[PDB]
């Protein structure tokens with residue numbers, strides 16, 4: 193031991209320990225139970241996690257995120273060429289492999305995706321070591337079910353560089369199903385749908401579980417749909433509102449839009465547990481404050497297509513698995529965006545009122561299942 197589970201997420205990572213028969217998800221040094229998968233290079237230092245995400249607006253070309261979208265791929269891959277068009281950092285080719293290029297200590301440096309991911313893993317390892325005391329030797333690390341062997345190996349390589357013994361690489365939906373004990377529940381074969389809606393990715397997986405054996409039946413989703421898209425919709429609405437009341441267009445002003453997005457991200461979170469949220473921005477533009485409120489109903493309206501549209505990958509995963517929706521025995525919610533009541537309602541209505549597995553914090557379920565698996569493997 194310790195028995196450690198790591199969800200190495202596209203934008204946020206999570207670490208858990210299995211200790212005294214149960215999982216404890218581990219808060220980092222800022223008290224956050226998830227950590228940005230962000231690495232920033234400055235004139236003096238490397239920042240990882242919250243420190244890196246917190247200065248991203250100040251240092252966008254040297255702050256790396258989404259290394260998960262590059263790991264294990266070739267520079268020439270269509271997803272690489274497409275994704276690069278949307279990143280503020282530079283991506284280059286070395287021996288046909290993508291590398292991020294940054295300025296660090298005043299010089300140009302290049303890093304393989306597994307090097308950036310190892311830095312994130314080192315931060316997750318240190319987070320576990322502050323919580324536990326001593327050293328962490330081994331971990332189970334998760335990857336998307338659709339990852340190929342090159343992506344799995346390059347993720348393991350990030351673990352190796354970090355100096356972790358990688359006990360197993362397991363699929364993220366499998367880890368979520370293990371968190372809910374679905375491999376020990378009830379006994380026959382179970383069809384399980386994992387609905388994982390993150391800040392920037394949406395993955396639907398159908399698995400069968402039988403006598404403790406998992407098989408991936410189908411995968412579907414949208415690799416560029418997440419919680420940030422819902423935030424975009426609220427930002428547009430509220431920038432329009434500020435224009436209506438104060439006759440000022442914040443649109444050409446980067447800092448004003450960024451601060452509006454920060455308020456919107458926070459409001460969206462509150463709206464998963466309250467029916468309204470208050471925006472309180474001091475001097476948003478030309479000394480004019482933006483103090484206002486948004487209701488949950490308005491938020492659902494702004495996102496009607498995006499929320500309802502999550503059922504199309506559900507239908508496609510069923511079609512590919514050759515299953516009727518009535519054949520799903522378990523539905524598991526994963527990702528912070530599944531806290532949104534309207535998403536839960538749409539999903540539950542689609543499945544004819546079936547209850548959802550949602551009692552585990554959905555942004556922690558994957559690390560939680562990875563931690564149980566690690567405990568099993570170290571025995």
Ligand SMILES: Sc1nnc(-c2ccccc2)o1
Nearest residue numbers: 341344345348358359360361
């Ligand atoms: S450890 C461990 N579990 N799965 C792997 C793996 C799978 C494919 C390619 C490379 C490593 O490693």
